[model samples]
Target: ELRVGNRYRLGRKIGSGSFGDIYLGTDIAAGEEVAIKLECVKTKHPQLHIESKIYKMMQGGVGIPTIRWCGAEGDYNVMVMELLGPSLEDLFNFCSRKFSLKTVLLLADQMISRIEYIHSKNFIHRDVKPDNFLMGLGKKGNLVYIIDFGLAKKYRDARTHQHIPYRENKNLTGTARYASINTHLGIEQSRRDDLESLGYVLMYFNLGSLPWQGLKAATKRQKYERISEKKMSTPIEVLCKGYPSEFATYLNFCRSLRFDDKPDYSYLRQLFRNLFHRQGFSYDYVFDWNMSGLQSVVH
Candidate 1:
């Protein structure tokens, strides 16, 4: 029964993101659907305002959502953006939790492109995970779009062009499963960390599970420490396991990158592209869910 900007009417609660809950919204005048994220105005650390700013900075990029409006209404700060389809996690579950090599490759190409674009804008997506990447809706369903900028950080000063100073003893800023080893060690995240996280995501899609998943410990801190230790000890070859060697190569490259190293985005993308070509898969976006007739799975 709530309205935003006096134009968009909030509908059913759809889900929640890192910062707040999300609701389905409709533009009263245009009859268009949108996704509205709401954060409390009294939040100790208000992320919606900062996320809106980053969205504005990332506008017009291929996989970035078009932010429609952002402002405060009563006790909530609201953000309206293009309504995207189910997230990769949703589709993954619908597809029974495993993705085909072809689907993973296709996704890999686009995922790399998205992070590359974000890095080009001098920002690093600290939280890279399956839940943050969604497919476009309807006609654009085939395209992969990266969402959720709540954890995004500007890595370089636009005016001075100087990169953020390297530092240690930082808390992990992303999902434990997809966070880079450096992030696990409390090292400051950078462009390389983003790519490294992307590497883990791709591996997860292909393998359905990661070694660090479902770890048990008495305390949350102990669990995180165990996960970090396991990540450090797990070799790339073992981590990639039965998959293509290119995946292992990708992880190795990401792990070897220095703190502030400008990653070879094209090279990393090409590594996956080469595997895609070798496997004789076309560039078509006919993902697993598409072929399985599960497009209607999303509400």
Candidate 2:
């Protein structure tokens, strides 16, 4: 029987993370359903506060969720925001952990739009992975939403709007599985790195797994190093086997970007669009899961 902001009542726990738990909540006064993230000061991440500020800063950004209310409660920081549907990771599993090429293109286009908008705002989502991309609910179900700004950071100064200096040997800051080659090499992350990691995500969605996924090493460092090498050295054709040639070309474009280079977003988008046209597929929200004959309905 816990309440927040003196008006919203906490319901069942809906999520758990390193910082705290997320609850389905209700604003008593407004009679609206909201998602509340509760982070205890003792166990809270330093970036949790930064994340709230980012949500506030990015208000009205397309594909970004709206933050309704936020404040401190007792020893906890509470964040109330719009509740969304299952993540891309969940959807992947629902489709028997695989998505068809058509479905992959649909997802890729939305991700590109969201990432382009994010970069235009001078922020880089250092962590680009399946779990971070979610689907909208009901009427908005066809739309894709990007979530979790905890690992996001400014790549350029606001006042000067200049790209920050590149630094090497920084700590690896994202999930190792989907991290870019530069990330594994301890290079500073930037917009290009976001696109690079995004490339890995799209490939993963299409292939259901990466070649280096289960490689074993004596230590975490060794394992990641080996994975990075494989990613860097794998022949594009071989890596893109069972998929279209443009998939490899898309990855090559990402790898070719310099640290400060503005990604040719138009070119990248055109690559997928070209594939769509050649393959005779239309951009409809009816994804592979819908075609799987699954009777599951989500709101």
Candidate 3:
């Protein structure tokens, strides 16, 4: 029954965030569906405003979501944006947690591009996981879109282009499951951390799980420590066991990068592209769900 900005009509609750609810809204004027995120004005950590600003900064970048409008309404901060399709995590679960080599490689190509674009804008997406990467709808369904920049921060000065100073003993800023070893060791995140995290994500999708996943510990902090230890102990070969050697190479490259090192994005994408070509797969974008008739259930 609620209308936003006197134009978008709010509909059913589609998702929830740390501070608010996400609605499947309709732009009555344009007759198009959009995602409306509403956060209470009184909330202590107001993320919608910051997220909207980041979205605005990243507008027009490939794989970045388009922000339609953002404004305050009564007691809330509302943001309307393009309604995207399911996340990689959602699709992963739908496929029984297993993604073929071709699927993972295809995703790698686009995922790297998304992170590269984010870095080019001087911001580092601290959180790069399956849940943050989503697919587009309909005609762009094959396209991967990066979202949820609530944890993102500028890695370098925009005008001066000076990289942030490297520090240690800082708190971890991203999910424990996919965080880089440096992140776990209290090092400040940079462009390399995002790529490293993405490497883990690709491996997760290919192998169906990481060795550190589901580790049991008495406390959450202890669990995080355990996960970090597991990741440290698991060598790249062991982690990428039975999979293509390209994955191992990707991780090694990410780990070899210095704090201020600019990742060879094109080289990373080329790694997967070579694999894709060698596998005799085309860039058709016909994913597992598409062939499995899961398209109808995605929305």
Candidate 4:
């Protein structure tokens, strides 16, 4: 069963994720290429819709995958996304399962915008990993896009324009090793959870190993104790070792894993741009922004 003449023709199986199989297809109509990911009904079919929603919302936005088409077909859901080239798997593997500053920062620069924009829309991508990221459509493998939102959740905020994380309904949505401290502690989440998670992800890219290192804690309390006491040494400093001043400072603070504290979006947005901004930021990336800068102005 194939749809020909400019649509997609399901070819060979490419790979699979938490959901189901992905097929390499030829878009006959546009003479282009795409990856059609098929999902069964009872699995992540409904959850991957979050990825569709993200692509729709991120349309024309920077550093995100463009969704050509997505919908349900019979007993399954199909996602037709613009096919980019090979991923960073090889480079990472060759580099000892770690990405250099240039590669990681470039990716972070693009992905951070996407995540912050998602935050603005009150969406939380419970899944963020290398598998979901790929180079742009038919490019030289420089540009990238975030993928795999099967475990994502659309956060309904009643906190007046805040992008606070969904913490109250904590049952460990995504990868536990990469979970933020707030999520791990059964605390109500704020936008800070995503930030902390990003820090952990960056650490992973640098280390190329499972997070939390060697010790296996029996409980959440002991897990965080290892992190707090520096028993579980992460690449928090090494990854940002020689990056630009603007990036290093921000990253160091993020790795601190202080859920109750964050470097307000305004500050972070500017920091990403040039590492410094005195006149305040022009864009508020996070929803229900805390406006922490107001306090500094009055002081």
Find the candidate with the highest TM-score and give its number: 1
Measured with C-alpha atoms, the lDDT of residue 189 in candidate 4 is: 51
Residue-level lDDT of model 1, residues 1-299, one tens digit each, is: 56799989989998988778889999998999999999998899888888899999889899899999998899899899989889999999999999999999889999999999998899999888898999998888888999988889889988876999999999776688888998888889999898998899888898888887767665666777877888889998999988899999999999999988889999998998888888887767789998822121121
TM-scores of all models?
Answer: 0.94, 0.91, 0.93, 0.68
TM-score of 1: 0.94
For residue 259, give model 4's deviation from the true position in Å. 6.8
lDDT of 3 by residue, 25-71 (tens): 99988889999999999998778888889999999898899999899
Q: What are the lDDT scores of the predictions, listed in order?
A: 0.87, 0.83, 0.88, 0.58
Candidates sorted by lDDT, best first:
3, 1, 2, 4
lDDT of 4 by residue, 1-299 (tens): 57622368878887876566678888877677788877777773355576677668767755566778787776777888777765544445655675654455555666676677666666667666565666664333455666666666555453565444434645555555566655655666545667666666655675675445444555655554564344234455554555455555665555464444433666555565553233343433311111211110000
Which stretch of 10 consecutive residues in model 2 shows the poorest summed lDDT? 290-299
Clashes of 1: 0
Per-residue CA lDDT of candidate 2, range 141-249, in tens?
A: 8889998887788988888889989999998777777778888788899888888888888988988888877666666667767777887777767878878888888
